[PDB]
Amino acid sequence: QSVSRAAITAAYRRPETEAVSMLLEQARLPQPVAEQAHKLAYQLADKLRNQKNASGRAGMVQGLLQEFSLSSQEGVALMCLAEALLRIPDKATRDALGEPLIRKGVDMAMRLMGEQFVTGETIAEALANARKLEEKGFRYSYDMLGEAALTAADAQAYMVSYQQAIHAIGKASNGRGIYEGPGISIKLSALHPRYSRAQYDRVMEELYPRLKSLTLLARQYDIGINIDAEESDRLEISLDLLEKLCFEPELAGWNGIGFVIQAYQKRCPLVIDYLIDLATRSRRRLMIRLVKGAYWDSEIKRAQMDGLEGYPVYTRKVYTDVSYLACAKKLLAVPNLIYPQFATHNAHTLAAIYQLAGQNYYPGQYEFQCLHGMGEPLYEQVTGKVADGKLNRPCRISAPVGTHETLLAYLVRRLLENGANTSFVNRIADTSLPLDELVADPVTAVEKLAQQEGQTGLPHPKIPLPRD
Amino acid sequence: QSVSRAAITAAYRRPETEAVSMLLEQARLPQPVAEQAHKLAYQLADKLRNQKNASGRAGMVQGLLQEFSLSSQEGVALMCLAEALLRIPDKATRDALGEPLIRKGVDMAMRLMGEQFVTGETIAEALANARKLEEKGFRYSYDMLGEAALTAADAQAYMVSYQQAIHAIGKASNGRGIYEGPGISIKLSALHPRYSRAQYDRVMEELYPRLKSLTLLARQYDIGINIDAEESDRLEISLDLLEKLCFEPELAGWNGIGFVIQAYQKRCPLVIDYLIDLATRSRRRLMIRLVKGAYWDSEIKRAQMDGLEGYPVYTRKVYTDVSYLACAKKLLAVPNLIYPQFATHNAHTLAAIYQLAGQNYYPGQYEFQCLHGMGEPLYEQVTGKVADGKLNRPCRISAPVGTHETLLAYLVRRLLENGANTSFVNRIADTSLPLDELVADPVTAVEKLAQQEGQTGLPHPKIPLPRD
Ligand SMILES: Cc1cc2nc3c(=O)[nH]c(=O)nc-3n(C[C@H](O)[C@H](O)[C@H](O)COP(=O)(O)OP(=O)(O)OC[C@@H]3O[C@@H](n4cnc5c(N)ncnc54)[C@H](O)[C@@H]3O)c2cc1C
Ligand SMILES: Cc1cc2nc3c(=O)[nH]c(=O)nc-3n(C[C@H](O)[C@H](O)[C@H](O)COP(=O)(O)OP(=O)(O)OC[C@@H]3O[C@@H](n4cnc5c(N)ncnc54)[C@H](O)[C@@H]3O)c2cc1C
Ligand SMILES: O=C(O)[C@@H]1CCCO1
Ligand SMILES: O=C(O)[C@@H]1CCCO1
């Protein structure tokens, strides 16, 4: 292997104490920057949580719960009475006074809960719902729902769907280009049957020509084409595919190739070193989406089943946060080589990147990204004119496209993301959790744990090593 | 009295059979227009009710309620199970598996329910929340909360508040003018202590100089100033005040005086005849807001207490709808004399006016209006570019400004409006009520009642004459 590829392999499952300890000083924000990040994060979170006065309304309630010493059911009952009294029109009058069921249920619940996360059932429908926010300065990336093709027919169908989508997105883009215009996002698992266990030779013979074909088509329309990151044991083969792609003569001088990297992996900073070298060698600027990662629950389960020396992902959420910040700094340092795309719904992560990107923003420096049905409210404060009180930074919405038949796995990942007590989007909804704790600096949080526990970067107390 | 003023007085409490019968042919939409109004009303209501697929989601539920013959509590329980199963990360695992309390309560409930209807606590705050929709083509009218002044001090305070507001709105308007720019809306009851029983002489001596002063100030800033319509026994004195105002030399050639007329009153079309003559005589274009009316419940109660020969308002809601359409036609016929402002949250009423206004709309022909916290969703389909799928017709939002201390009566009127089973905004929320019934033509509805009951315009069966 090359030096950079070798360093990736060696970090696959490195002990958490070691990985976190080495990331800490790279993630640490200089005091002045940390202070500005905190103020901004607080302001974003405050406006988001309290757009409709949720905390104030919650407080007024508690106040009356004391000025009468009433229970919850008591207060509510009183409000119902008060409500009925307020409907008296005249103030004087008022004053004076088997398995098929379970299978069907699961499928239905999937559709119902999933609707909010889906942009359109077809690319035409999805594209129709774009101008609304595109006119506000939002950008889109259409991500076809449908993954882990099981048969050759399945993979063929997905391929045809991607090709069709690129034609439609490309026509809609109408020359706007890879930055300002919409792009497409693809899953390698959709393009090759049984990708999860596919061997190198077959992937290169069968998957790669498809990846190449789609990328050439994207180039013809000058739209971005992004390669989603999936399970951790597919990282290596995805880098082999990216490497070959970047050296295609027909793609020379074109910078529309995109690639996701997952900060929850111990390999992430080493993958960045590789990507930096690859951009240099292939003479291009790579569009790199930095994300935390969507498969954490399954990654933990897989590792515990395989009984290996460790986990490929962190086991405490705050460590993933630290990884993300350290990786963000690395990406921002090389603007000639990488166009970083910072995917997050987290107000602190957003504010930290905003400050880390430094003075003198220019549109092509970087962008933020979010998922449809999750990020729009937060980014309404971000994308738009400074005169309208926004930060004037671009955000690209990832827009799932597909019917109920392709939605299941994506929906489950969204449930896990939204429902986890560690997720920012879960915690911000809790009016009980103080804003300062919500936007707490992750580096400081890690040092706090270290002081309590006796060393830095210890694994989650409830997630022992697989061999234990 | 003049001919027109005399005709108003004579219609005060005319029998409903008579009033409705005479309105019917003036309200009737020609077959071609009625058809276009129906299609548009249906489309508006469909998009409004089903923006987030409410009816479709409701149907999918009923479908499973049959493919298993389950109860509501049953279906729900199943969904909770399905939801828990969808949170299993791996599919294989899933597959394999005293009075102070009441007074305090009423006040608190008022604040909580009222927040959605209030634009700002102060004019500065309200104005701050304006650009968002103003940039979309929406206009504003700021209506200071606070009415029925009880003391001289009270009325003085309201006066000072109006003056301050006009300065702030006028500065914000910055020369945009009476049509494109924001205006103010005033309540005569706020400007004179115990207005409800005030005598003509005192009103002219004390109230009128205040009305004149505010109107002159509005003119200096070239913003609209609208006189709200309140209880029916104050109609006459309000016309006396308007008459005098329109002949002030300092207001000559200025068309920013506005006046509300309430279609639920039997006098409404006669008031229009008067207003038409007044515009002609005083050489101006009057800004006339056509509304249905906000005080219906209290009007019925007052009439039943006074034991007079009849009601000053209609007793069936569909009659008020018919009155509104007939009055709208009258206003639209005289564009040189009246700038009509059609206040409604009703999709049929909106669509009917749209069609009645005819071909070749121009901005100064007319506008729609709505209340903050009620109309924005419907008018999001109306105000905006045709390319964005909107009707490209202007809407002015009435924006209440005030603290909790001035909010009570307004809030109660909003509760009555939103909570009445006859209100469009109540009925559209009922996914059980078919769209075609929701947007049913009121003239046809009245003829249907007439065929069933034996004559046209009979009173509400549950609202007999006061003397009965
Ligand atoms: C536009 C976009 C594209 C994306 N593309 C991909 C993609 O191709 N592949 C992919 O895998 N993800 C992708 N993601 C990321 C993913 O889907 C989640 O949205 C993301 O991880 C949420 O991070 P956050 O900063 O918004 O929320 P935060 O609440 O700040 O952090 C959320 C999470 O931290 C992690 N986590 C949770 N618990 C732990 C723990 N105990 N230990 C360590 N880590 C933990 C997770 O990665 C997780 O989602 C994408 C996200 C976006 C917005
Ligand atoms: C911008 C704006 C300004 C307004 N200004 C004023 C004002 O100065 N003074 C004022 O009094 N109102 C005013 N209103 C009107 C009022 O507040 C209500 O919003 C209005 O009457 C609702 O009509 P709608 O077409 O939206 O709803 P719809 O559901 O179509 O009709 C609603 C209603 O019909 C009436 N009604 C209900 N039941 C009956 C019945 N049994 N018999 C006869 N009529 C019945 C009422 O007038 C009532 O509100 C204003 C409204 C707006 C939007
Ligand atoms: O499929 C997922 O969950 C993530 C987010 C978007 C693409 O990769
Ligand atoms: O006070 C009311 O309820 C109505 C609506 C706005 C002004 O007059």
Side-chain angles (χ1 to χ4, degrees), chain A residues 181-201 203-215:
Chain A
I184 194 171
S185 213
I186 72 184
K187 279 179 163 61
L188 298 173
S189 72
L191 292 172
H192 188 87
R194 307 287 294 271
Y195 181 64
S196 58
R197 300 187 60 86
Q199 307 275 99
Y200 172 95
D201 286 341
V203 169
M204 293 304 165
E205 296 171 356
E206 303 171 13
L207 203 177
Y208 180 80
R210 284 179 168 168
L211 179 62
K212 176 182 173 188
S213 180
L214 295 175
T215 304

Coordinates of all heavy atoms in Angstrom, one line a residue, chain A residues 181-215, unseen atoms left out:
Chain A
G181 N -25.6 24.8 -8.4 CA -26.7 24.0 -9.0 C -26.8 22.7 -8.2 O -26.0 22.3 -7.4
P182 N -27.9 22.0 -8.5 CA -28.2 20.7 -7.7 C -27.3 19.6 -8.2 O -26.7 19.7 -9.3 CB -29.6 20.4 -8.1 CG -29.8 21.1 -9.5 CD -29.1 22.4 -9.3
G183 N -27.1 18.6 -7.4 CA -26.3 17.4 -7.7 C -27.0 16.1 -7.4 O -28.2 16.1 -7.0
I184 N -26.4 15.0 -7.6 CA -27.0 13.7 -7.3 C -26.1 13.0 -6.3 O -24.8 13.2 -6.2 CB -27.2 12.8 -8.5 CG1 -28.1 11.6 -8.2 CG2 -25.9 12.4 -9.1 CD1 -28.6 10.8 -9.4
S185 N -26.6 12.1 -5.5 CA -25.9 11.3 -4.5 C -26.2 9.8 -4.7 O -27.3 9.5 -4.9 CB -26.3 11.7 -3.1 OG -25.2 11.7 -2.2
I186 N -25.1 9.0 -4.7 CA -25.3 7.6 -5.1 C -24.8 6.7 -3.9 O -23.9 7.0 -3.2 CB -24.7 7.2 -6.4 CG1 -23.1 7.2 -6.2 CG2 -25.1 8.2 -7.5 CD1 -22.4 6.9 -7.5
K187 N -25.4 5.5 -3.9 CA -24.9 4.5 -2.9 C -24.3 3.3 -3.7 O -25.0 2.7 -4.6 CB -26.1 4.0 -2.0 CG -26.4 4.9 -0.8 CD -27.5 4.4 0.0 CE -27.5 5.0 1.4 NZ -27.7 6.5 1.3
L188 N -23.0 3.0 -3.5 CA -22.4 2.0 -4.2 C -23.1 0.6 -4.0 O -23.1 -0.2 -5.0 CB -20.9 1.9 -3.8 CG -20.1 3.1 -4.1 CD1 -18.7 3.0 -3.5 CD2 -20.0 3.4 -5.6
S189 N -23.7 0.4 -2.9 CA -24.4 -0.9 -2.6 C -25.6 -1.1 -3.5 O -26.0 -2.2 -3.7 CB -24.8 -0.9 -1.1 OG -25.9 -0.1 -0.9
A190 N -26.1 0.0 -4.1 CA -27.2 -0.1 -5.1 C -26.8 -0.6 -6.4 O -27.6 -1.0 -7.2 CB -27.9 1.3 -5.1
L191 N -25.5 -0.5 -6.7 CA -25.0 -0.6 -8.1 C -24.4 -2.0 -8.3 O -24.0 -2.3 -9.4 CB -24.0 0.5 -8.5 CG -24.6 1.8 -8.6 CD1 -23.5 2.9 -8.7 CD2 -25.6 1.9 -9.7
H192 N -24.3 -2.8 -7.3 CA -23.7 -4.1 -7.4 C -24.4 -5.1 -6.4 O -24.6 -4.8 -5.3 CB -22.2 -4.0 -7.0 CG -21.4 -5.3 -7.2 ND1 -20.8 -5.5 -8.4 CD2 -21.2 -6.4 -6.4 CE1 -20.2 -6.7 -8.4 NE2 -20.4 -7.2 -7.2
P193 N -24.9 -6.2 -7.0 CA -25.6 -7.2 -6.2 C -24.8 -7.7 -5.0 O -23.6 -8.0 -5.2 CB -25.9 -8.3 -7.2 CG -25.7 -7.8 -8.5 CD -24.7 -6.7 -8.4
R194 N -25.3 -7.8 -3.8 CA -24.7 -8.3 -2.7 C -23.3 -7.6 -2.4 O -22.3 -8.3 -2.1 CB -24.5 -9.8 -2.8 CG -25.8 -10.6 -3.2 CD -26.7 -10.6 -2.0 NE -26.1 -11.5 -0.9 CZ -26.3 -12.8 -0.8 NH1 -27.1 -13.4 -1.7 NH2 -25.8 -13.5 0.1
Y195 N -23.3 -6.3 -2.5 CA -22.2 -5.5 -2.3 C -21.5 -5.8 -0.9 O -20.3 -5.8 -0.8 CB -22.6 -4.0 -2.3 CG -21.5 -3.0 -2.1 CD1 -20.5 -2.8 -3.0 CD2 -21.6 -2.1 -1.1 CE1 -19.5 -1.9 -2.9 CE2 -20.6 -1.1 -0.9 CZ -19.6 -1.0 -1.8 OH -18.6 0.0 -1.6
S196 N -22.3 -6.0 0.1 CA -21.8 -6.3 1.4 C -20.7 -7.3 1.5 O -19.7 -7.2 2.3 CB -22.9 -6.7 2.4 OG -23.5 -7.9 1.9
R197 N -20.7 -8.3 0.6 CA -19.7 -9.3 0.6 C -18.9 -9.4 -0.7 O -18.2 -10.4 -1.0 CB -20.2 -10.7 1.0 CG -20.8 -10.7 2.5 CD -21.2 -12.1 2.9 NE -20.0 -12.9 2.9 CZ -19.2 -13.1 4.0 NH1 -19.4 -12.4 5.1 NH2 -18.2 -13.9 3.9
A198 N -19.1 -8.4 -1.6 CA -18.5 -8.5 -2.9 C -17.0 -8.5 -2.9 O -16.4 -7.7 -2.1 CB -19.0 -7.4 -3.8
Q199 N -16.3 -9.2 -3.8 CA -14.9 -9.3 -3.9 C -14.3 -8.2 -4.8 O -15.0 -7.7 -5.7 CB -14.4 -10.7 -4.4 CG -15.0 -11.8 -3.6 CD -14.2 -12.2 -2.4 OE1 -14.6 -11.8 -1.2 NE2 -13.2 -13.0 -2.6
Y200 N -13.1 -7.8 -4.6 CA -12.4 -6.7 -5.3 C -12.6 -6.9 -6.8 O -13.0 -6.0 -7.5 CB -11.0 -6.6 -4.9 CG -10.2 -5.6 -5.8 CD1 -10.0 -4.3 -5.4 CD2 -9.6 -6.0 -6.9 CE1 -9.2 -3.4 -6.1 CE2 -8.9 -5.2 -7.7 CZ -8.7 -3.8 -7.3 OH -8.0 -3.0 -8.1
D201 N -12.2 -8.1 -7.3 CA -12.2 -8.3 -8.8 C -13.6 -8.1 -9.4 O -13.7 -7.4 -10.5 CB -11.7 -9.7 -9.1 CG -10.2 -9.9 -8.9 OD1 -9.5 -8.9 -8.9 OD2 -9.8 -11.1 -8.8
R202 N -14.6 -8.6 -8.8 CA -16.0 -8.4 -9.4 C -16.5 -7.0 -9.3 O -17.1 -6.5 -10.2 CB -17.0 -9.3 -8.6
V203 N -16.1 -6.3 -8.2 CA -16.5 -4.9 -8.1 C -15.9 -4.0 -9.1 O -16.6 -3.2 -9.7 CB -16.1 -4.4 -6.7 CG1 -16.3 -2.9 -6.6 CG2 -17.0 -5.0 -5.6
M204 N -14.6 -4.2 -9.4 CA -13.9 -3.5 -10.5 C -14.5 -3.8 -11.8 O -14.6 -2.9 -12.7 CB -12.4 -3.8 -10.4 CG -11.7 -3.2 -9.2 SD -12.1 -1.4 -9.0 CE -11.6 -1.2 -7.4
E205 N -14.8 -5.1 -12.1 CA -15.3 -5.5 -13.4 C -16.7 -5.0 -13.6 O -17.0 -4.7 -14.8 CB -15.2 -7.0 -13.5 CG -13.9 -7.7 -13.4 CD -13.9 -9.2 -13.3 OE1 -15.0 -9.7 -13.2 OE2 -12.8 -9.8 -13.3
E206 N -17.5 -5.0 -12.6 CA -18.9 -4.7 -12.8 C -19.4 -3.4 -12.2 O -20.2 -2.7 -12.9 CB -19.7 -5.9 -12.2 CG -19.3 -7.3 -12.8 CD -20.0 -8.4 -12.1 OE1 -20.9 -8.2 -11.2 OE2 -19.5 -9.6 -12.3
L207 N -19.0 -3.1 -11.0 CA -19.5 -1.9 -10.4 C -18.8 -0.7 -11.0 O -19.5 0.3 -11.3 CB -19.2 -1.9 -8.8 CG -20.1 -1.1 -8.0 CD1 -19.8 -1.3 -6.5 CD2 -20.0 0.4 -8.3
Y208 N -17.5 -0.7 -11.1 CA -16.7 0.4 -11.6 C -17.2 1.0 -12.9 O -17.3 2.2 -13.1 CB -15.2 0.2 -11.6 CG -14.5 1.4 -12.1 CD1 -14.3 2.5 -11.2 CD2 -14.1 1.6 -13.4 CE1 -13.6 3.6 -11.6 CE2 -13.5 2.7 -13.8 CZ -13.2 3.7 -13.0 OH -12.6 4.9 -13.4
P209 N -17.4 0.1 -13.9 CA -17.9 0.7 -15.2 C -19.2 1.5 -15.0 O -19.4 2.4 -15.8 CB -18.1 -0.6 -16.1 CG -17.2 -1.6 -15.5 CD -17.2 -1.4 -14.0
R210 N -20.0 1.0 -14.1 CA -21.3 1.8 -13.8 C -21.0 3.1 -13.2 O -21.6 4.1 -13.5 CB -22.2 0.9 -13.0 CG -22.9 -0.2 -13.8 CD -23.8 -1.1 -12.9 NE -24.6 -1.9 -13.7 CZ -25.4 -2.9 -13.2 NH1 -25.3 -3.2 -11.9 NH2 -26.1 -3.7 -14.0
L211 N -20.1 3.1 -12.2 CA -19.8 4.3 -11.5 C -19.2 5.3 -12.5 O -19.5 6.5 -12.5 CB -18.7 4.0 -10.4 CG -18.2 5.3 -9.6 CD1 -19.4 5.9 -8.9 CD2 -17.1 4.9 -8.6
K212 N -18.3 4.8 -13.3 CA -17.7 5.7 -14.4 C -18.7 6.3 -15.3 O -18.6 7.5 -15.7 CB -16.6 4.8 -15.2 CG -16.0 5.6 -16.4 CD -15.1 4.7 -17.1 CE -14.6 5.4 -18.4 NZ -13.8 4.4 -19.2
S213 N -19.6 5.4 -15.8 CA -20.7 5.9 -16.7 C -21.5 7.0 -16.1 O -21.8 8.0 -16.8 CB -21.6 4.7 -17.1 OG -22.6 5.1 -18.0
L214 N -22.0 6.8 -14.9 CA -22.8 7.8 -14.2 C -22.0 9.1 -14.0 O -22.5 10.2 -14.2 CB -23.2 7.3 -12.8 CG -24.2 6.2 -12.8 CD1 -24.5 5.7 -11.4 CD2 -25.5 6.5 -13.6
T215 N -20.7 9.0 -13.7 CA -19.9 10.2 -13.4 C -19.6 11.0 -14.7 O -19.7 12.2 -14.7 CB -18.5 9.8 -12.7 OG1 -18.8 9.1 -11.5 CG2 -17.7 11.1 -12.4

